[PDB]
């Protein structure tokens, strides 16, 4: 099964907002599809981490044994599905990544740092944006204007 993570935010003079880097941390809460167990802990997964699965199943970002029912579950970030959140997406949900899930679905998301974006006309780069507080403000010197990302929210959808 594939699950899409959709972001929404209110944008100020900003576009091309996206996760960057192999070490980018997707902080998630995950639910075992066998027994309904949801760990209390935020757990992060990264592209950088990559474990072989058995059969011709390829790879996963994380494999774990559910603590309640003991099933081996896995999740894989699909690198090719990572998409930017752009000025035209303002205030709409948009899929920014997809996960290949084998027995374990993400049910919550805590964005933190490692995002990047760009001034919409200036093209000035804003690197390592931390969205943990769901609101972010900076100033674009070239464009002589404020930039911001506000009211960040998310949802998961089947895909
Ligand atoms: Zn379980």
Numbering used by the authors: 2 to 160
Reproduce text from the manuscript describing this model.
In order to identify intracellular metalloproteins, we performed yeast two-hybrid screening of the human proteome using CCSdI as bait and found that an uncharacterized protein encoded as open reading frame 123 in chromosome 1 (C1orf123) interacted specifically with CCSdI. Instead, the overall folding pattern of C1orf123 and MAL13P1.257 is unique in that it is not observed in any other proteins registered in the protein data bank. C1orf123 is thus expected to perform some tissue-specific functions, but as of now, no definitive conclusions can be drawn on the function of C1orf123.
The phase was successfully determined due to the anomalous signal from a zinc ion in C1orf123, allowing us to solve the crystal structure at a resolution of 2.0 Å. In addition, a bond angle (∠S-Zn2+-S) ranges from 100o to 117o, indicating the symmetrical tetrahedral coordination of a Zn2+ ion. The most notable difference is that C1orf123 but not MAL13P1.257 binds a Zn2+ ion. C1orf123 is like a rugby ball in its shape and has characteristic charge distribution on its surface; the zinc-containing side of the protein is positively charged, while the other side concentrates negative charges. We also found the positively charged pocket adjacent to the bound Zn2+ ion.
